[PDB]
Design a binder for these strands. Structure first.
Ligand code: ZN
Lengths: 48, 998, 59, 48, 116
RNA sequence: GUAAUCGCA
DNA sequence: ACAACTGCGATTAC
DNA sequence: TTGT
């Protein structure tokens, strides 16, 4: 049996409250859904 | 029989030394013990040496390390005491004492501490024949004889024959007189010696003649003698011969001896030290037996043998040896590599050896004899440079105390192949060629030429004349240097730096193997001792985190694992199961993986994407810019465990009492304490909290507090009641906190090629430069270090790593791959990159225009960079030195009792020191007031310092101190204790009056 | 072109458990206590106890 | 590129409460993984 | 061998030992391996035979014969080359299976389980 | 508070 | 008889 | 030790 708290934020969260209510451990979370991205720009060959 | 077809065990040296010790040294020492007979009736006690039997330890190693007890064996020998009145000898077995036992890894457990015995290199006894040129005239020739104790029976020759010994402090001594005293009748002397015309024309004792077996052999070698090995004494024939050679040197018929040659040196192992310690313990035992016999005679009682002997001498001797000897050091357990590299050290400095200052320059350089036997790139940086070195991988210690190396014999014979551990002096008279044979010039292959070694020289000869060949790749290096991939492309100077920096790595929370490696990590992790290797074949019936059950041949064996332990250097030790339930394991395979080891190979770092370019100055000098991915993904997270202990020392007036309820303390603290005065497990603590609370009546509050920087969970606490000290001893309470440390600005990172840096900025992934793939680089390094420190193998590594990551391959490459062809490393690297580019169609990985270089973009603006950059995935390690450990700051807290200056050390919360080289700079700048303030009220002036806090809190101006500091006053007091006065005596220019300042 | 020395020698599987019973590894390291006991260098506590009991019974 | 990486937010587990564990660096009987390993596993739980 | 376990579990028997084993009665399958120190492939075969002996602790007997010491016996057994394995069944009416070359360990297991 | 030993740059 | 880099930090042993 |  374990309890979980779910939160919605952005970026990465540092587990600042290490000293807190007993029995609950805070885990740092990364709220970045996109893993990687890339773009490329090719010409169209339209003259002027 | 072993080590001639594979790499030998790294800990085999200590193993065989301890084995030879237990086999022969104990009996040899017990043989030389004298018969105790000190009385008129001559009551004689004897120890039957034949009945020598060691007994297994009563406790285990896991109990000795836990209870801080020594791991030793019981020596029981039957003894017979013949009483004077009884006229008979009663025979009983007595417990002489404890003898420490060595683990399979080479370490010993004494008082719960892991300690290793470093070997020592000492000059062998023998005759040496040095020469020295005089200021005016012919060169003086001298011959020195060296004994085991260290005697120096020198012999010298002047412009004339003048065979004069330098034993006496006086001008000289007659060699003929010494020979006549030896027993020569002045006729057989001239009859036996060669060139008798020169001898005839010219017109304490036990230690000098205490030549060892080794000494005897050497004497025989240099001076051809047929004296049997057994007669280990300085015979006069040896002296006569010595004289003959000496005179012969004057006429050119001789060769001087090199005292830096290995053949002239001996190696002392753990056996040699333990034998001497056992001899000293036996001497103490004989003294104690004589004393107790004298006492029993005074008390008119004939006692049993057990009453005479006490277990004190052996135990106290071995304890003092392991505690205070300069060749017994605590094992370094920062990482598995340190445990193995610590036991391979050979040291010149030590008891009976050259001190740092004493050592001449010649001593500290490589001698051609060191090839294959000693590491030429592993030394200790500092004042002891060239005095502390490691031991080659394939070396062994010989029967005669000489390091031996394995040489293949290419000479044709019945077997046609041999692997012989030739000693240092023997390999000199052989043509040893390290080159290959892949050359044909329209003639027979044996007519080809190859570089070779002969008579401590280098030359080129035909393949017909080469007797030996050095085939082993890791023969000339050590464990530290051999773990450097592409070492040929790196400078020899940076190799020492890389070997030293590999030792500093911190075991991380997670471990990953290296894509590029040398293939020695496997045996390194095998012999490190932090791995679970089965000692029996069978099947794993039960798998658990704490223990593993192995069922074989109808027997079940339980192996206990290590779960978050603590090392000597505040590094966590943990083990994880590798084999699943229901598979068979042989005797020797890996059951579990320890810290800094994954899949059975040493893993001291991670593989991260790296680009070599300058980025906005953040890479100036050496400095690294890293991304936040290493932070929020726990790539370089590590666990560090520090212990704090305070003993409950019982004073004569009152014992210490441990209570939780202690007044005069705030309610914010003491929350973690239990009913008893100790912190609870699983409690988060910080700086300034109370871990153990004590009343300390003698009341007061000698408690345990946390220092600056200590913020970790309390994993475990131990109440250790101390016993065995012949009386009630204080209890010991040891707390352990675990601090999880992430990668931060100020941490040091390094690469296996000698590249070291300190993190300077943690940029986000969006600002980091990205490749054409779209992935941001994890680190950015400065490209100007390569021409500076001459590290080219790093480029190779990076590229091969990128290739491997893409193709999912790991490369274990032996060093010096250019023995096959030219540019073998370049061909391999470019071939693997092309394949990666073709298989995963990323054209960027191999650019035909610039192989190994790609064109990346800027994360900030999105514009491509002008020139291509190197993209790779090297192996980066995180070093032990960390910013948190190095941070320090003092305002005004504590002072020394006598000096009254601020205290020293970071743990003691002390300030920084203004030395003489900084006072000089301050005086050159002209800042007199700053120097005066630092020299008086920030350091030593008690009154001024007391007033400084008040003046700063109120805000008033701080007056200039006029009184002398406590340092000057101390001097005056000291000098006046030395009957010397000192008075300031300032004179006023206004009224011409003298005023004394006290 | 292709290297003379085969690359397959350097290639190694990433998730591979190193078998220490291969041809390139030495013999397994024997535990010091068991190695000394098997050769008779160190006796067990039972043998010493039996010897002491026999010596006491003889006396 | 700068929007997809750093300007998109998500949801993740931020706090875990365990029943009868002394600390997060210990082992519980009946589970092959320690508390820290369980926290690391829960850290990689993707939610929407 | 009480304190330290033996590293290798396959014993080198002679030709007379094999003749006595075949002539006598057996309750477990028998595996005969011909090897020579010189053959390279045999170095691997020996490792797989060690693994098989560990997997079959007392349900099968595994022995090895050196061809250098017994060449005539190996020639009489119709042994063409070195990586050869002889599988002797326990019941003496069934036919022995001879395998040549390096074969996977699973093949050996299946042969011992079904064919023998 | 002193030593020993190692490291650091 | 005298002196031979500067400091810092860690450990164990008294 | 190395030299003073
Ligand atoms: Zn190379």
């Amino acid at each position: 049996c374990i309890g979980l708290q779910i939160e919605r934020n952005r970026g990465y969260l540092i587990k600042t409250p290490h000293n807190f209510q007993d029995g609950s451990y805070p885990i740092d979370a990364v709220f970045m859904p996109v893993r990687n991205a890339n773009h490329s720009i090719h010409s169209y060959g339209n003259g002027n | 029989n072993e080590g001639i077809s594979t790499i030998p065990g790294f800990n085999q040296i200590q193993f065989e030394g301890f084995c030879r010790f237990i086999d022969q040294g104990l009996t040899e020492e017990l043989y030389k013990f004298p018969k105790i007979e000190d009385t008129d009736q001559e009551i004689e006690f004897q120890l039957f040496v034949e009945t020598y039997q060691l007994v297994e330890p009563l406790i285990k190693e896991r109990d000795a390390v836990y209870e801080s007890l020594t791991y030793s064996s019981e020596l029981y020998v039957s003894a017979g005491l013949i009483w004077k009145n009884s006229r008979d000898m009663q025979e009983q077995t007595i417990f002489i004492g404890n003898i420490p036992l060595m683990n399979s890894l080479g370490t010993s457990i004494v008082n719960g501490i892991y300690r290793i015995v470093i070997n020592q290199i000492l000059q062998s006894p023998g005759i040496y024949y040095r020469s020295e040129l005089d200021h005016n005239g012919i060169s003086v020739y001298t011959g020195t004889i060296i004994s085991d104790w260290g005697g120096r029976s020198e012999l010298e020759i002047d412009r004339k024959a003048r065979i004069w010994a330098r034993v006496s402090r006086k001008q000289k001594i007659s060699i003929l007189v010494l020979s006549s005293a030896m027993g020569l009748n002045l006729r057989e002397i001239l009859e036996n010696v060669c060139y008798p015309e020169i001898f005839l024309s010219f017109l304490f004792f036990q230690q000098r003649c205490e030549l060892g077996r080794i000494g005897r052999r050497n004497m025989n070698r240099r001076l051809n003698l047929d004296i049997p090995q057994n007669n280990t004494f300085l015979l006069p024939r040896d002296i006569l011969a010595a004289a003959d050679h000496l005179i012969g040197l004057k006429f050119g018929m001789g060769a001087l001896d090199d005292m830096n040659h290995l053949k002239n040196k001996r190696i002392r192992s753990v056996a040699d030290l333990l034998q001497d310690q056992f001899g000293l313990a036996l001497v103490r035992l004989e003294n104690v037996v004589r004393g107790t016999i004298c006492g029993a005679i005074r008390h008119k009682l004939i006692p049993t043998p057990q009453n005479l002997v006490t277990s004190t001498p052996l135990t106290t001797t071995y304890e003092s040896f392991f505690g205070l000897h300069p060749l017994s050091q605590v094992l370094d357990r920062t990482n598995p590599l340190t445990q193995i590299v610590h036991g391979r050290k050979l040291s010149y400095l030590g008891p009976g050896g050259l001190t740092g200052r004493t050592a001449s320059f010649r001593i500290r350089d490589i001698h051609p004899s060191h090839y294959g036997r000693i590491c030429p790139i592993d030394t200790s940086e500092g004042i002891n440079v060239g005095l502390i070195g490691s031991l080659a991988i394939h070396a062994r210690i010989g029967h005669w105390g000489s390091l031996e190396s394995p040489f293949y014999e290419i000479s044709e014979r019945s077997t046609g192949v041999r692997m012989l551990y030739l000693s240092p002096g023997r390999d000199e008279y052989y043509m040893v060629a390290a080159g290959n044979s892949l050359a044909l010039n329209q003639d027979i292959q044996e007519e080809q030429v190859v570089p070779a070694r002969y008579r401590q020289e280098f030359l080129t000869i035909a393949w017909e004349q080469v007797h030996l060949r050095s085939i082993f790749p890791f023969q000339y290096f050590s464990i530290g240097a051999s773990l450097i991939p592409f070492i040929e492309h790196n400078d020899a100077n940076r190799a020492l730096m890389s070997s030293n920096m590999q030792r500093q790595a911190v075991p991380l929370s997670r471990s990953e193997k290296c894509i590029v490696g040398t293939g020695l990590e496997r045996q390194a992790a095998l012999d490190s001792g932090a791995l679970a290797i089965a000692e029996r074949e069978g099947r794993v019936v039960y798998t658990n985190t704490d223990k593993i059950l192995l069922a074989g041949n109808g027997d079940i064996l339980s192996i206990p694992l290590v779960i978050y332990q603590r090392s000597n250097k505040n590094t966590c030790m943990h083990q994880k199961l590798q084999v699943p339930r229901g598979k068979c394991i042989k005797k020797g395979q890996i059951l579990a993986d320890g810290a800094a080891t994954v899949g059975g190979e040493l893993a001291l770092g991670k593989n991260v994407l790296v680009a070599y370019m300058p980025w906005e100055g953040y890479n100036s000098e050496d400095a690294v810019l890293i991304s936040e991915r290493l932070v929020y993904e726990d790539i370089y997270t590590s666990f560090h465990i520090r212990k704090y202990e305070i003993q409950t020392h019982v004073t004569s007036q009152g014992p210490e009492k441990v209570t939780n309820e202690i007044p005069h303390l705030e309610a914010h603290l003491l929350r973690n304490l239990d009913k008893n005065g100790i912190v609870m497990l699983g409690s988060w603590v910080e700086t300034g909290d109370i871990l153990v609370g004590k009343l300390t009546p003698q009341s007061k509050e000698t408690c345990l507090k946390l220092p600056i920087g200590g913020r970790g969970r309390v994993i475990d606490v131990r109440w250790i009641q101390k016993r065995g000290g012949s009386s009630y001893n204080p209890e010991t309470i040891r707390v352990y906190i675990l601090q999880k440390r992430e990668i931060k600005v100020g941490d040091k990172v390094a690469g296996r090629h000698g590249n070291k840096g300190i993190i300077s900025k943690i940029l986000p992934r969006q600002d980091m430069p990205y490749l054409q793939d779209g992935r941001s680089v994890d680190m950015v390094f400065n490209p100007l270090g390569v021409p500076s420190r001459m590290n080219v193998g790093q480029i190779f590594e990076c590229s091969l790593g990128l290739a491997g990551s893409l193709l999912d391959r790991h490369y274990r490459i032996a060093p010096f791959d250019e023995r096959y062809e030219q540019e073998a490393s370049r061909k391999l690297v470019f071939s693997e990159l092309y394949e990666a580019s073709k298989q995963t169609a990323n054209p960027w990985v191999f650019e035909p225009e610039y192989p190994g270089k790609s064109r990346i973009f800027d994360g900030r603006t999105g514009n491509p960079f002008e020139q291509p950059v190197i993209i790779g995935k090297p192996y980066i390690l995180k070093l032990i030195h960390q910013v948190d450990d190095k941070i320090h700051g003092r305002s005004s807290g504590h002072y020394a009792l006598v000096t009254q200056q601020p205290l020293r050390g970071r743990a003691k919360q002390g300030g920084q020191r203004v030395g003489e080289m900084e006072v000089w700079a301050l005086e050159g700048f002209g800042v007199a007031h700053i120097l005066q303030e630092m020299l008086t009220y920030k350091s030593d002036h008690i009154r001024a310092r007391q007033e400084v806090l008040g003046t700063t809190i109120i805000g008033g101006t701080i007056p200039n101190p006029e009184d002398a500091p406590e340092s000057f006053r101390l001097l005056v007091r000291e000098l006046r204790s030395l009957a010397l006065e000192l008075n300031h005596f300032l004179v006023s220019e206004k009224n011409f009056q003298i005023n004394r300042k006290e | 072109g292709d290297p003379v020395y085969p690359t397959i020698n350097y290639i190694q599987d990433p998730d591979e458990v190193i078998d220490y019973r291969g041809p390139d590894f030495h013999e397994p390291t024997p535990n010091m206590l068991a190695y000394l006991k098997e050769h008779g260098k160190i006796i067990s506590r039972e043998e010493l106890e039996k010897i002491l009991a026999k010596e006491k019974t003889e006396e | 590129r700068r929007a997809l990486l750093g300007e998109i937010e998500g949801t993740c587990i931020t706090r875990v409460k365990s029943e009868k564990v002394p600390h997060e660096y210990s082992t519980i009987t009946g589970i092959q993984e320690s508390v820290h390993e369980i926290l690391m596993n829960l850290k990689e739980i993707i939610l929407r | 061998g009480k304190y330290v376990r033996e590293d290798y579990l396959v014993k080198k028997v002679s030709a007379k030992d094999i003749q006595e084993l075949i002539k006598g009665e057996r309750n477990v399958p028998l595996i005969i391996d011909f090897y020579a120190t010189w053959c390279g492939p045999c170095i691997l075969m020996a490792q797989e035979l060690e693994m098989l002996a560990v997997e079959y602790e007392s349900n099968a007997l595994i022995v090895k014969v050196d061809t250098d010491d017994e060449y005539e016996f190996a020639r009489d057994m119709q042994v063409r080359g070195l990586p050869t394995l002889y599988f002797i069944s326990p019941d003496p009416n069934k036919d022995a299976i001879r395998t040549e070359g390096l074969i996977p360990i699973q093949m050996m297991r299946d042969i011992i389980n079904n064919d023998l």
